């Protein structure tokens, strides 16, 4: 069983190393019956297209951010509500409990089998013009977002205007002035080179998104129980590794961007940004009353 897998990041990124460890452990633990290979840098497609190829069984496994999953799996959109998690540690705690299984079940209905959860820190605004200290500083900024309408609503409510765009296109768009900014965690802001062209990083920390390590349902269904169990074990090992590497990477990436002269600032009052997101939550629970208890259960877990 040859398996092809997808990663958007470079091979040396925390997620990349963890997926290479996964591939190696799978081959060993299945005695060569399943032999995964990871293709990095999104060479097999942009994230929405890779999601579709994995759902249809054309790709066997992947590491997907739950952000672009929202338009495909309704429950996953809960994770894209701005500020729904107070910190990465709260996200890990919640996703590692019974609530995380609700999201795995929802993905399975759309042909994706979640084996473990990777972290992706906290996404913050960066731009080419000035520090963002209050929401009014976002006025006039054209900010790239991922492919989920909630992010357009998010930027618009903060005061700016948004444009959905593939991750691979962002560097050149910033360089040429087509966009003024984008938003991401420390390791992506650094790895991608965006920090070289957008020198202001303002810690809005507005999205804390899980990422899955998942397998195509069609590929999963070809396996014996023994090999399913082996691959589960390999994925749990890979997630523990990824999370440890992740924190080391946040530290290393911050040092690199500081050394390069990036201007990092805290926002005056994060609660001022959070208050402006209220209409997004209102509209969401009105549209999706069947998801309301998922939203309130996550909120209640962080009182
Ligand atoms: O902004 C993006 O598109 C990227 O953001 C990173 O944080 C996620 O790890 C990666 O999956 C996304 O493709
Ligand atoms: Cl981060
Ligand atoms: Cl993409």
UniProtKB/Swiss-Prot annotation:
Tagged with keyword Transport: yes
Record localization: Periplasm
Example GO molecular function: carbohydrate binding
Keywords: Periplasm, Signal, Sugar transport, Transport
Highest rank taxon of the organism: Bacteria
Positions of beta-D-glucuronate binding: 9, 47, 123, 144, 167, 184-185, 211
Coiled-coil boundaries: none
Any one GO BP annotation for this protein: transmembrane transport
A GO CC term attached to the entry: outer membrane-bounded periplasmic space
UniProt subunit comment: The complex is comprised of an extracytoplasmic solute-binding protein and a heteromeric permease formed by two transmembrane proteins.
Function according to Swiss-Prot or TrEMBL: Solute-binding protein that binds D-glucuronate (in vitro). Probably part of a tripartite ATP-independent periplasmic (TRAP) transport system that mediates solute transport into the cytoplasm.
Similarity-based family: Belongs to the bacterial solute-binding protein 7 family.
Protein name per the record: Solute-binding protein Csal_2479
Source organism of the structure: Chromohalobacter salexigens (strain ATCC BAA-138 / DSM 3043 / CIP 106854 / NCIMB 13768 / 1H11)
Taxonomy of the source species: Bacteria, Pseudomonadati, Pseudomonadota, Gammaproteobacteria, Oceanospirillales
